Amino acid sequence: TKQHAFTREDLLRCSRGELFGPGNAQLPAPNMLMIDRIVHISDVGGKYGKGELVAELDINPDLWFFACHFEGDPVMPGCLGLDAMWQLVGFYLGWQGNPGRGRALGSGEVKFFGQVLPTAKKVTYNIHIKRTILVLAIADGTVSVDGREIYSAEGLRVGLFTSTDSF
Amino acid sequence: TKQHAFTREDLLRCSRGELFGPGNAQLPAPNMLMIDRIVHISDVGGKYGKGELVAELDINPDLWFFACHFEGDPVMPGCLGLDAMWQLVGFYLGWQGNPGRGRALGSGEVKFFGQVLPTAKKVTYNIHIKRTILVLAIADGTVSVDGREIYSAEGLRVGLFTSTDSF
Ligand SMILES: O=C(O)c1ccc(COc2ccc3c(c2)CCC3)o1
Ligand SMILES: O=C(O)c1ccc(COc2ccc3c(c2)CCC3)o1
């Protein structure tokens, strides 16, 4: 709760289990990691008074997903921008000190109404925590490219599992 | 409309633009391609009488996404199983003979209530086309692993763009 911003090296440390400890929430490592930095994280403020994350991914034409998606028509997969928002809600649960392994549980409405091209510079993620309740978080999120909102997600859900025995 | 099943080599040909032609719907190439085969595609039957796709992805412990997602806790990303369902709805629009480039436009409710582990053998996707209406398709979908339903998506939307001038 004391650290309110994270560098890429902090996120890579998180991906090895060395930020929140083994058996606790982990970001993916490359090439599934869809965040370079967490600019802001808090458990107060945001749209619902329950905290907020702002994170960034730098874009350059050589990122792996442009060449295969699609050949002659490069565009960052919508599913990976959506996954960044699940990655951030999971990070929030870990950052609050909750134990267990993170899984996305789904979302209400997702809309893709724009695209990240290899000429873009920066994708920004805004997450508004709605409720924390296994331990799970519900959040709304946007994805923006160079100032332009392009995706929205309502009711993003991520849970932490300490025991899967009964499921 | 004459071909009702597709091999991996057919899907790779689709990913190069050589199945539906340049400027038309393309599957991603590896490593974003989340389908090995289309077992069944039709424009009649399915849950709503508007056709159906059944597709498969073989699972083995060496698939790239297991090592990075997550370190010491391998699980196929939920976002990639969801993306397979968008990939299949886009394939359906191309298979019907519609021109233009495919984009996911989003979904209503997505639920992840199980997981694909590196011990699994086969993921199966079931897509029920709800409505075709730019040209877009609305569908419901499930992801199953070795017979067990693990994800559901309602209101998957994919559109084809012949012109982006006005957007
Ligand atoms: O992975 C995808 O299918 C994906 C990524 C982003 C999108 C959304 O694509 C869009 C969505 C809306 C518009 C455009 C493209 C250009 C014209 C307006 O789809
Ligand atoms: O990429 C993900 O976060 C992801 C993939 C699949 C899931 C869902 O994870 C789940 C969802 C439900 C259950 C388990 C795991 C084991 C106990 C029951 O989340």
Side-chain angles (χ1 to χ4, degrees):
Chain A
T1 277
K2 287 98 211 162
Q3 194 168 327
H4 298 84
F6 295 86
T7 63
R8 188 165 160 80
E9 292 298 326
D10 294 331
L11 301 193
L12 292 177
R13 202 154 47 77
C14 180
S15 82
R16 284 186 249 107
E18 299 162 359
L19 184 62
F20 304 132
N24 298 327
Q26 274 176 272
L27 287 168
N31 286 330
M32 274 306 304
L33 178 56
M34 290 295 135
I35 310 152
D36 280 325
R37 75 192 67 87
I38 296 171
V39 162
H40 179 72
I41 177 171
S42 176
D43 59 3
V44 295
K47 211 186 214 251
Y48 302 104
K50 294 258 103 82
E52 165 190 57
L53 303 91
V54 184
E56 297 174 343
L57 178 68
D58 299 325
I59 301 303
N60 70 67
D62 299 316
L63 288 180
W64 69 270
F65 47 66
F66 282 131
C68 59
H69 189 283
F70 306 92
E71 296 198 6
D73 178 27
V75 55
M76 185 184 178
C79 71
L80 291 182
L82 178 52
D83 204 56
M85 295 192 286
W86 284 317
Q87 291 171 27
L88 287 160
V89 175
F91 186 95
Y92 182 89
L93 283 175
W95 181 85
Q96 277 191 314
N98 300 290
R101 296 177 292 139
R103 296 289 189 272
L105 300 182
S107 53
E109 203 173 54
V110 175
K111 288 181 172 174
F112 304 143
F113 45 91
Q115 56 181 351
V116 183
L117 295 179
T119 53
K121 309 300 176 182
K122 198 161 60 165
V123 167
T124 302
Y125 312 106
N126 280 269
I127 312 294
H128 307 287
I129 306 302
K130 202 163 184 211
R131 218 186 328 144
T132 57
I133 289 165
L134 59 35
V135 173
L136 76 102
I138 307 176
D140 298 343
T142 66
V143 181
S144 301
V145 62
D146 302 330
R148 311 159 61 127
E149 194 184 319
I150 55 164
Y151 314 163
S152 62
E154 289 157 16
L156 297 158
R157 297 168 190 263
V158 176
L160 301 178
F161 294 83
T162 55
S163 174
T164 60
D165 249 321
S166 109
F167 291 86
Chain B
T1 277
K2 287 98 211 162
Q3 194 168 327
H4 298 84
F6 295 86
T7 63
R8 188 165 160 80
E9 292 298 326
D10 294 331
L11 301 193
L12 292 177
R13 202 154 47 77
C14 180
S15 82
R16 284 186 249 107
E18 299 162 359
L19 184 62
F20 304 132
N24 298 327
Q26 274 176 272
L27 287 168
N31 286 330
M32 274 306 304
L33 178 56
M34 290 295 135
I35 310 152
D36 280 325
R37 75 192 67 87
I38 296 171
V39 162
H40 179 72
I41 177 171
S42 176
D43 59 3
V44 295
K47 211 186 214 251
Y48 302 104
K50 294 258 103 82
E52 165 190 57
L53 303 91
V54 184
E56 297 174 343
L57 178 68
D58 299 325
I59 301 303
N60 70 67
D62 299 316
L63 288 180
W64 69 270
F65 47 66
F66 282 131
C68 59
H69 189 283
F70 306 92
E71 296 198 6
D73 178 27
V75 55
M76 185 184 178
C79 71
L80 291 182
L82 178 52
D83 204 56
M85 295 192 286
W86 284 317
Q87 291 171 27
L88 287 160
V89 175
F91 186 95
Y92 182 89
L93 283 175
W95 181 85
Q96 277 191 314
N98 300 290
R101 296 177 292 139
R103 296 289 189 272
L105 300 182
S107 53
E109 203 173 54
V110 175
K111 288 181 172 174
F112 304 143
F113 45 91
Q115 56 181 351
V116 183
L117 295 179
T119 53
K121 309 300 176 182
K122 198 161 60 165
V123 167
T124 302
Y125 312 106
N126 280 269
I127 312 294
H128 307 287
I129 306 302
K130 202 163 184 211
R131 218 186 328 144
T132 57
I133 289 165
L134 59 35
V135 173
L136 76 102
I138 307 176
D140 298 343
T142 66
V143 181
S144 301
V145 62
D146 302 330
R148 311 159 61 127
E149 194 184 319
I150 55 164
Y151 314 163
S152 62
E154 289 157 16
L156 297 158
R157 297 168 190 263
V158 176
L160 301 178
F161 294 83
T162 55
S163 174
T164 60
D165 249 321
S166 109
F167 291 86

